[PDB]
């Protein structure tokens, strides 16, 4: 104090459903629902959005809005001896923007190939197909559908990559849209959140503009009733498995965004006494309901796509790229008034991604330039070198074998990280600083204290909830691969220095500050484990 | 059940200080913030300060605010009200009152306890 | 400081008629926020009416409360002579926290 605030409680609201909103909602719940019983997902989806998901959604924000800092400055306050939580967080954001930006790039790369009155990726008589490409999606490995070798012999070019070793030619039309995302995200991000609370007004609402539109010609589509049946429709025999508990609980995880930071800066910003608990709610509920509808925006296609263009719903319901960047173009291409619907599409991919993006790089900025009066007082240079430092390394991604770049962070780089930082998270706030201090926290806040359903779900529900999600990701283990292709031993453990290199942080920071410290060790946990609050009276 | 006893007042001459203390039972001390509120003789109503249920957020009125300290036993459950420089504005009956949820009002009070500063 | 000026100041009434009175505030007032105490002659006050509408535990029927902004008030739709005492309204929208001017409500006869 002072410290900068939202030019209106609006961009706030925009700004965490922009983040927490992305492709996810799209190529990856729609696809749960219809491989874990239908409708019956929703059961353990919604206990698991409840007690596992919200509750951390809820504390994050709430901390954030608090504490008044980034990441690091606020754990290091709320409990000194864990300040390290705060670098790991910012180095897991710092490295997920190597990747993620890549898909947004994909995105554009497909929109600028989208001007046109006969989509590439239509038919096998092109100088990049294959003789055994098919028009659309089949069972059989060697025989890729005509938008599948679009995407992977012409956009991509991986076939010229013989593995991760083998990063090939740089390719410049990727970079080109690579490097118009980061222009993009900087023209955004410089200003402070002034303007980057404005942008959003555009990337977190035109998505649901397509998403209308294309949930119309979804639904006017032959066959569409059917796709909503593969959906939909309930199997409650699905429920007894735990391995469906399982994809609940890390899809609640990952589709909302606690403990990356993000929340937590985006917060920052917020007057003290507003009613974060109400917007918490509020954003859960239109991130879930976003996915629930963007699944019927898929299977109403998949739908059509099975009836009319004879092929089986279980090789198009697909999640991840080849969903967006593969099947979906292929339906849409068979559809009239064809270009229109690539080019909202492709857009909606994009705006999709670049909410999200903004949120990891503000986790950053906002984290250093709390730690960092020097960068704080040169945003808009540091921003330039950190975009800058992104699109060279992101220059790998852009490579001929560069999927399998992407592929190996996007595994390693986050995944295994953030789980255990936010378990600390949970664990610090509940049971080190207090559900106590946080409860009366949160009352001078709002005016009332959490209910002891909050509480009792931050104390014990939440821990063994994400260590419910990281003992089923243990032992479900296996070695990095991607289509025919091993990763050999090196790259794994190579990604596991990235994975380890933030986790790391936590009991080397905890290390080094019990290092600084005078006194005797019943006396040190004590002077590293009181909060900021209350030695400043 | 709920049960809040105020103690203590009495007269105090200008200048002079004196502490008012207030008993919590039948609920959770610790869970609730407390307030003090005092009557004057003319029978209107003033809020004087507030604390936390943790006690690390205190308000106070400007009238008493340097003068007046408001503390917190979570242990004995016993709420305190230090005051000092006295002055005969400050006469009044002194309630405490129970209020952790400000959407909800001061839900229970004292009995009360006089303080007359005269000279 | 946020003044809380309540009117009338002293009221009497038959039991049975219909009451109002009401609670006007110097600056606006979440309706969430705004209580209502009744102090029967010589005992504490007891909370009565909270966020505006809502009774509190044990208070009749009668009682019923509205508002919004910097206008409120208590209404008692049939007085009964165990109703008469001093009514006090009251904000925690803001510190310091400020309490009504009060109006004694009484018995006709």
């Known amino acids: 104090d002072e410290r900068e605030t939202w030019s209106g409680k609006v961009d706030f609201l925009l700004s965490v459903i922009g983040f927490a909103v992305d492709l996810a909602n799209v190529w990856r719940f729609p696809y749960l629902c219809y491989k874990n019983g239908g409708g019956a997902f929703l059961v353990p989806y919604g206990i698991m959005l409840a007690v596992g998901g919200i509750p951390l959604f809820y504390m994050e924000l709430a901390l954030g809005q608090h504490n008044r800092k980034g990441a690091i400055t606020c754990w290091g306050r709320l409990v000194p001896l864990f300040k390290g939580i705060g670098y790991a967080v910012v180095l897991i954001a710092f490295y997920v923007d190597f990747y993620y930006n890549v898909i947004i790039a994909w995105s554009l790369r497909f929109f600028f190939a989208s001007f046109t009155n006969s989509l590439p990726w239509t038919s096998c008589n092109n100088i990049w197909n294959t003789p055994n490409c098919r028009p659309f999606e089949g069972h059989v490995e060697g025989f890729q559908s005509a938008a599948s070798e679009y995407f992977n012999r012409y956009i991509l070019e991986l076939n010229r990559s013989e593995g991760i070793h083998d990063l090939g030619a740089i390719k410049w039309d990727m970079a080109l849209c690579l490097l118009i995302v980061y222009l993009i995200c900087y023209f955004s991000l410089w200003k402070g959140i002034s303007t980057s609370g404005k942008v959003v007004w555009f990337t977190a609402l035109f998505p649901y503009a397509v998403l209308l539109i294309l949930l119309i010609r979804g639904l006017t589509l032959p066959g569409s009733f059917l796709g909503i049946q593969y959906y939909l429709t309930p199997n409650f025999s699905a429920i007894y498995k735990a391995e469906v508990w399982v994809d609940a609980a890390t899809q609640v995880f990952f589709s909302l965004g606690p403990g990356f930071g993000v929340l937590l800066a985006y917060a920052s910003y917020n007057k003290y006494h507003n009613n974060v608990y109400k917007d918490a709610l509020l954003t859960s509920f239109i991130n879930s309901a976003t996915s629930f509808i963007a699944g019927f925006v898929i299977f109403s296609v998949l739908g059509y796509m099975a009836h009319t263009l004879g092929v089986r719903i279980e090789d198009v319901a697909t999640e991840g790229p080849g969903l967006v960047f593969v099947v979906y173009p292929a339906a849409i291409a068979t559809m009239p008034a064809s270009t229109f619907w690539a080019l909202i599409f492709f857009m909606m991919l994009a705006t999709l991604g670049l909410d999200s993006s903004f949120g990891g790089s503000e986790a950053i900025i906002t984290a250093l330039s709390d730690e960092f009066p020097k960068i704080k007082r040169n945003r808009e240079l540091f921003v330039a070198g950190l975009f800058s430092l992104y699109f060279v390394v992101g220059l790998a991604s852009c490579t001929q074998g560069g999927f399998y770049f992407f592929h190996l962070l996007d595994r390693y780089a986050a995944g295994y990280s953030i789980l255990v930082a936010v378990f600390f998270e949970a664990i610090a706030v509940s049971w080190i600083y207090g559900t106590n201090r946080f409860s009366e926290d949160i009352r001078d806040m709002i005016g009332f204290p959490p209910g002891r359903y909050w509480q009792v779900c931050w104390r014990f529900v939440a821990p063994i909830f994400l260590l419910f999600i990281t003992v089923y990701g243990l032992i479900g283990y296996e070695p990095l691969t991607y289509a025919d292709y091993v990763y050999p031993s090196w790259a794994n453990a190579l990604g596991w220095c990235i994975a380890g290199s933030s986790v790391v942080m936590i009991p080397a920071v905890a290390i080094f500050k019990l290092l600084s410290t005078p006194g005797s060790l019943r006396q040190r946990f004590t002077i590293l484990t009181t909060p900021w609050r209350d030695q400043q009276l | 059940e709920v049960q809040l006893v105020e103690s203590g007042g009495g007269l105090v001459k200008p200048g002079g200080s004196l502490k008012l203390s207030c008993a919590a039972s039948?609920?959770?001390?610790?869970?609730?913030?407390m307030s003090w509120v005092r009557q004057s003789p003319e029978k209107r109503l003033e809020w004087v300060a507030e604390?936390?249920?943790?006690?690390?957020?205190?308000y106070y009125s400007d009238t008493v605010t340097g003068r007046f300290t408001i503390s917190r036993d979570n242990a004995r459950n016993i709420l305190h009200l230090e005051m000092s420089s006295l002055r005969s504005e400050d006469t009044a009956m002194y309630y405490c009152?129970?209020?952790?949820?400000?959407?909800?009002?001061?839900?229970?009070w004292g009995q009360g306890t006089t303080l007359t500063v005269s000279s | 400081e946020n003044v809380l000026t309540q009117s009338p100041a002293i009221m009497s009434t038959s039991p049975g008629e219909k009451v109002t009175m009401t609670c006007r505030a110097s600056?606006?007032?979440?309706?969430?926020?705004l209580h209502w105490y009744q102090q029967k002659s010589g005992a504490s006050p007891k909370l009565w009416i909270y966020?505006?509408?809502n009774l509190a535990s044990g208070v009749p029927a009668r009682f019923s409360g509205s508002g919004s902004g910097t206008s409120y008030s208590l209404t008692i739709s049939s007085v009964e002579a165990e109703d008469a005492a001093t009514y006090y309204c009251?904000?925690?929208?803001?510190?310091?926290?400020?309490f009504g001017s009060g109006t004694k409500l009484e018995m006709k006869r």
């Open positions: 009152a129970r209020g952790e949820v400000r959407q909800r009002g001061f839900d229970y």
């Open positions: 039948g609920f959770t001390f610790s869970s609730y913030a």
């Open positions: 604390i936390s249920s943790g006690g690390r957020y205190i």
């Open positions: 600056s606006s007032v979440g309706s969430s926020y």
């Open positions: 966020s505006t509408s």
């Open positions: 009251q904000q925690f929208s803001g510190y310091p926290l400020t």
